[PDB]
């Protein structure tokens, strides 16, 4: 019996939490109530399997169970595992048509919290999990514990509003970031594969643990991959389990891995795990040999490459990464691929050594591109400020892929612009990994949102073509020369007066949605003419909106 197995390991509470998340991430449309019932019924059934390990169907696999339980409310169900299961995975909506989630006044939240606590918190998980079908579950529990703590304390404060609001904003961001990061994770695994996920894991960990040994890292990677392999496929319980052991393991062998892990291992499970996954890189090992030594100068290169290819590259990657925390994980993989491609042609040549001898020369180009992209992009940002810098990115991208839906273009660009204040404040050493990897995340949203209703084939190419090279791929794109402009419409710019109420941010976002609709209508337009109309539109609002009783001003 598996249900039993997992129950003993996670416990009543957590088992109850994870299972809620799984259902919320599968049938994002069903109401909170029907989820609860199924969660209990399923939990109930679990308690019996603990006693008798052969009762009803305690012998079955998780899926069969969870699958039939939902199939009592949910074509996915007209099949049988594994068929039945994966149908569900393919139907997770990344942009569900759920209603905006507004928050009642502070007083209500606190009463609702104080009265019933469990429900309050289960509601929390239900909402986040149904809107972010890929949210790294184990991690969601961490945010839940943090969420409870937010209220547990703020509600006994004086000015609750003052104490909560902030902590609440801090969680929306951090939780939003967490979700993107993981969506990329899953996307890697599901679209590109374990190997892909593995390489990324190798470089990234190797960067954080310069002192760990290739054989040590490789272990951490083989395990990590499994966690995520698991979490993404919906095996949320096993993911949470395995993830825990992995944390137990990293803490036990601390000395073999990093010296910054101390503070992480001296904390509760949940916080322990979050701490590790976010720890800063360990200091770099003192006297380290030159890469050129074993990977370009040695005459035994091609041989080793032929004996254990994947291992060799893994070593190459590990060795370059560990000593280059100032590069982004994508630049590394990129270099690593350049190396592999070279060995391939060079090894089947007359005098291999002479062929692959000047390989580091070809890295120079790939290494500067990002650096220049970053210097440039920050200089600009530094002069325009965040809002104007986003606008710069909004025009640029819209001209690039005019087909994309204005809403997507607005969010993506806004996000892309956040990189400015998110990274440009760091010294050159930490700027690239900060910047280019953050971009690969944002670009992944765009890729997934698009994937739903693919309209631009230029976006499709860049996205499917190569994971590691997307950011470059998009930067290539200039302006679509086949795009035949849109024709003004009224149904395209509903202006009804409900716009003098909205928050400041809600304004910019409207002033932004406009800017895109403009360019969508006048690509050939110029960055000079552009701001001129944009400025007139701002007056109309300012006008009409505080122009006595006028909903017609909008027409006039
Ligand atoms: C405007 C605002 O402040 O919204 C906040 C406030 C918010 C709607 C929150 C998401 C979720 O907890 C909400 C529920 C329904 C959660 C369950 C119950 O306990 C409610 C009594 C509670 C009230 C509003 C709250 C607390 C917010 C979010 C979501 C961001 C988070 C992530 C991971 C993407 C937000 O900041 O956008
Ligand atoms: C330059 C600037 O900051 O303008 C901002 C500021 C702005 C002129 C605003 C439109 C409108 O509320 C304005 C009125 C007259 C609304 C009625 C009253 O309460 C005034 C006391 C108020 C002051 C200025 C304000 C708040 C802006 C807009 C319009 C954007 C809205 C949408 C839907 C695209 C803008 O960002 O362009």
Polypeptide structure, described:
- The protein has helices at residues 2-10, 12-24, 32-51, 62-70, 83-90, 106-115, 117-131, 137-154, 160-192, 194-208, 214-232, 236-252, 254-257, 262-265, 269-278, 291-297, 301-307, 309-321, 329-347, 352-355, 363-400, 406-423, 428-452, 457-465, 470-476, 504-521, 529-546.
- It is globular and about 85 Å long.
- Helix 7 (117-131) crosses helix 8 and helix 8 (137-154) runs antiparallel to helix 9 (160-192).
- The longest helix is centred in the C-terminal third of the chain and has 38 residues, at 363-400.
- It is an all-alpha fold and 556 residues long.
- The protein folds into six domains: 1-93, Serum Albumin, Chain A, Domain 1, CATH 1.10.246.10; 94-183, Serum Albumin, Chain A, Domain 1 (Orthogonal Bundle); 191-282, Orthogonal Bundle (Serum Albumin, Chain A, Domain 1); 283-368, Serum Albumin, Chain A, Domain 1; 369-480, Serum Albumin, Chain A, Domain 1 (Orthogonal Bundle); 481-554, Orthogonal Bundle (Serum Albumin, Chain A, Domain 1).
- One fusidic acid binds at residues 101, 103, 109, 112, 120, 123-124, 127-128, 168, 172, 175-176.
- Keywords: Calcium, Cleavage on pair of basic residues, Copper, Disease variant, Disulfide bond, Glycation, Glycoprotein, Lipid-binding, Metal-binding, Methylation, Phosphoprotein, Repeat, Secreted, Signal, Zinc.
- The record marks 185 as: Aspirin-acetylated lysine.
- One of its GO terms (cellular component) is nucleus.
């Amino acid at each position: 019996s598996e249900v039993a197995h997992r129950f003993k390991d996670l416990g009543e509470e957590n088992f109850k939490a994870l299972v809620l998340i799984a259902f919320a991430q599968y049938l994002q449309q069903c109401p909170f109530e029907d989820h609860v019932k199924l969660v209990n019924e399923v939990t109930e059934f679990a308690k019996t399997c603990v006693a008798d390990e052969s009762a009803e169907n305690c012998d079955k696999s998780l899926h069969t169970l969870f699958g039939d339980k939902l199939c009592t409310v949910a074509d996915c169900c007209a099949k049988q595992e594994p068929e039945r299961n994966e149908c569900f995975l393919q139907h997770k909506d990344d942009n569900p048509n759920l209603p905006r989630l507004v928050r009642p006044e502070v007083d209500v939240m606190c009463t609702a919290f104080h009265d019933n606590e469990e429900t309050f918190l289960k509601k929390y998980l239900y909402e986040i999990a149904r809107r972010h079908p890929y949210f790294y579950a184990p991690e969601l529990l961490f945010f839940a514990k943090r969420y409870k703590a937010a209220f547990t304390e703020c509600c006994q404060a004086a000015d609750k509003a003052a104490c909560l609001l902030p902590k609440l904003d801090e969680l929306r961001d951090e939780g939003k970031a967490s979700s993107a990061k993981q969506r990329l994770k899953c996307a890697s695994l599901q679209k590109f594969g374990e190997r892909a996920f593995k390489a990324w894991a190798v470089a990234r960990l190797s960067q954080r643990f310069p002192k760990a040994e290739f054989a040590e890292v490789s272990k951490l990677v083989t395990d990590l991959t499994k966690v995520h392999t698991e979490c993404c496929h919906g095996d949320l319980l096993e993911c949470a389990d395995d993830r825990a052991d992995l944390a137990k393991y990293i803490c036990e062998n601390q000395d073999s891995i990093s010296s910054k892990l101390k503070e992480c291992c001296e904390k509760p499970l949940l916080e322990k795990s979050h701490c590790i996954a976010e720890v800063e890189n360990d200091e770099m090992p003192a006297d380290l040999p030159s890469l050129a030594a074993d990977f370009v100068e040695s005459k035994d290169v091609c041989k080793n490459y032929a004996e254990a290819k994947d291992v060799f590259l893994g070593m190459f990657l590990y060795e370059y990464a560990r000593r280059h925390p100032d590069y982004s994980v994508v630049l590394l993989l990129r270099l690593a691929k350049t190396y592999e491609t070279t060995l391939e042609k060079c090894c089947a040549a007359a005098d291999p050594h002479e062929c692959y001898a000047k390989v580091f020369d070809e890295f120079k180009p790939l290494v500067e591109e990002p650096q220049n992209l970053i210097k440039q992009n920050c200089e600009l940002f530094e002069q325009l400020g965040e809002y104007k810098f986003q606008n710069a990115l909004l025009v640029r991208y819209t001209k690039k892929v005019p087909q994309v839906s204005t809403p997507t273009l607005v969010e993506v660009s806004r996000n892309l612009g956040k990189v400015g204040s998110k990274c440009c404040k760091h010294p050159e050493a930490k700027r690239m990994p900060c910047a280019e990897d953050y971009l690969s995340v944002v670009l992944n949203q765009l890729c997934v949102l698009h994937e739903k209703t693919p309209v631009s084939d230029r976006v499709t190419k860049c996205c499917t073509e190569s994971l590691v090279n997307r950011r470059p791929c998009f930067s290539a794109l200039e302006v679509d020369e086949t795009y035949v402009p849109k024709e003004f419409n009224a149904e395209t710019f509903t202006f009804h007066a409900d716009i003098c109420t909205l928050s400041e941010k809600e304004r910019q976002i409207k002033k932004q949605t406009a800017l895109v609709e403009l360019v969508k209508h006048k690509p050939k337009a110029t960055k000079e003419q552009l701001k001129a109309v944009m400025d007139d539109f701002a007056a109309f609002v300012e006008k009409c909106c505080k122009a006595d009783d006028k909903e017609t001003c909008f027409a006039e």
